[PDB]
Design a protein around this ligand. Structure first.
Ligand code: MG
Length: 500
């Protein structure tokens, strides 16, 4: 048989009939629920830590495990990804992957409204998450071998990979729309980032599935390493608790908000380029080969820190990345229609929010906007909520439905145009006024609700503007003219660029 089939009792029987007949040692295995699959991943140190203090017994235990047919690499899992080709994962990663909490990412489109503009962009967060995990693994491995002095362990690598996998665990329906348009609009009081949901959901993930114990059985130390994983996704002498300042560079792998060069961006750049029909000048494998840790000293008392660094002449590669970054941002991300669709879906959700029930832990009812507060409710919240509203028989959603039917039948708000501020920019406070200003600026009455104003912000590494779009809801010609000239006058009045 396989060790995969073996229960802990089976392992106990195997241990007994091989000579380990002592009940406490058997109790170790029963207690820690060490199913067969773990056996080829056990260490001298692990057997020590689990609690066999016999310096010679441990060796022979591992010998017995080695005698068996199935080994370590016999239990890895291989994905076929079109971006990365073949992909090996250590079984723990699969165990994390194979949960409701994670699998839910199959049902959230990466580009959200994008899919309704770019029919190629059907890809979801799931596969992207896989990709990020894999790349994280790759970069950390490369740095590990190239500089063995760095003391980078299996544990670290796995933590980095898990951080990779779970960086997007907490995205809501339609990805950035949810955390970027809907929640801020529906819960202005709460400051919420999909990362927040990511760490909360990871915490939910390990707990719903009792993987703390499994993580221990595979050689992680849950207390430290979960904090490490969480901190990698989230962020903040040395602030982090997960790892010592000596291994600071590890925090630059998965999320590097400092200079915007991380494996997340690598994967989604490549993938979005793949599905949108854009060809990507940036070879990340080149980056990984020429990636090294080395020390930097900046005087603030002088600080000394280990950053990820690239050979100075590999600057051209970054020029390629940032081109692709701009290329995607211009063409796809800040796309005037995609955003319109995001806006309309948000609107529908806002109008659907009061009536739609979603049950969480203990079956407590939650609204779409409040599901983020309960992971077991949020676990059920996916893109499909789009159809659930659309198909609902409840007549209180008829308003919400009609918006969704309009998205389906391409009856969208009319895009009046884009504008740019000549000087200064617009205060985050000043936003909610804007639809009123446009409405009241005169060149038929046009109420403030008839307009949406969409503000968009355009936006280092070490070696060894504002766009305003105005949409009008009223779709008739005369209202369209009126709104157009309203918008022109508003632009002229605030001394903005003459519209597109
Ligand atoms: Mg991501």
């Amino acid at each position: 048989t396989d060790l995969r089939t073996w229960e802990p009792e089976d392992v106990c029987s195997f241990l007994e009939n091989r000579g380990f007949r002592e009940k406490k040692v058997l109790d170790i295995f029963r207690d820690n629920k060490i199913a067969g699959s773990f056996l080829p991943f056990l260490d001298e140190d692990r057997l020590e830590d689990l609690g066999v203090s016999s310096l010679e017994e441990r060796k022979k235990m591992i010998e017995c495990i080695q005698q068996l047919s199935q080994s370590r690499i016999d239990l890895m899992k291989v994905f076929n990804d079109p971006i990365h080709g073949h992909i090996e994962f250590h079984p723990l990663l699969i165990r994390i992957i194979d949960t409701p909490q994670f699998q839910r990412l199959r049902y959230i489109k990466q580009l959200g409204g994008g899919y309704y503009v770019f029919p190629g962009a059907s890809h979801n967060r799931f596969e992207h998450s896989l990709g990020v995990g894999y790349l994280a693994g790759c970069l950390v491995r490369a740095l590990a071998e190239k500089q063995p002095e760095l003391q980078i362990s299996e544990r670290d690598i796995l933590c980095v990979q898990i951080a990779g996998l779970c960086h997007d665990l907490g995205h809501g329906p339609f990805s950035h729309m949810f955390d970027g348009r809907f929640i801020p609009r529906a819960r202005p009081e709460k400051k919420w980032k999909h990362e927040q949901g990511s760490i909360e959901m990871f915490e939910h993930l390990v707990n719903s599935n009792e993987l703390k114990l499994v993580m221990k059985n595979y050689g992680l130390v849950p207390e430290e390493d979960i904090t490490f994983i969480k901190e990698q996704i989230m962020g903040p002498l040395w602030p982090y608790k997960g790892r010592p300042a000596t291994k600071s560079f590890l925090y630059e792998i998965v999320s590097n908000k400092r200079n915007g060069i991380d494996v997340d961006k690598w994967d989604y750049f490549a993938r979005d380029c793949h599905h949108l029909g854009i060809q990507n000048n940036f070879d990340y494998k080149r980056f990984i080969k020429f990636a090294r840790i080395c020390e930097v000293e900046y005087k603030v008392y002088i600080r000394k820190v280990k950053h990820i660094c690239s050979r100075e002449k590999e600057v051209g590669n970054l020029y390629d990345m940032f081109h692709t970054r701009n290329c995607l941002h211009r063409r796809a991300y800040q796309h005037k229609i995609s955003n319109l669709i995001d806006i309309m879906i948000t609107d529908a959700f806002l109008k659907a929010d009061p009536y739609v029930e979603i049950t969480g832990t203990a079956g407590k009812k939650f609204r779409i906007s409040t599901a983020i507060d309960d992971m077991e409710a949020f676990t059920k919240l996916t893109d499909n909520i789009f159809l659930e509203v659309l198909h609902s028989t409840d007549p209180q959603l008829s308003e919400a439905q009609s918006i969704l039917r309009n998205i389906e039948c391409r009856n969208l708000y009319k895009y009046l145009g884009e504008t740019q501020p000549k000087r200064e920019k617009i205060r985050k406070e000043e936003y909610e006024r804007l639809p009123q200003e446009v409405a009241k600026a005169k060149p038929v009455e046009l109420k403030a609700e008839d307009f949406i104003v969409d503000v968009i912000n355009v936006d280092r590494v070490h070696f060894y503007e504002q766009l305003i779009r105005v949409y009008c809801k009223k779709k008739d010609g005369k209202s369209l003219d009126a709104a157009g000239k309203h918008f022109v006058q508003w632009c002229a009045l605030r001394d903005f660029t003459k519209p597109q």
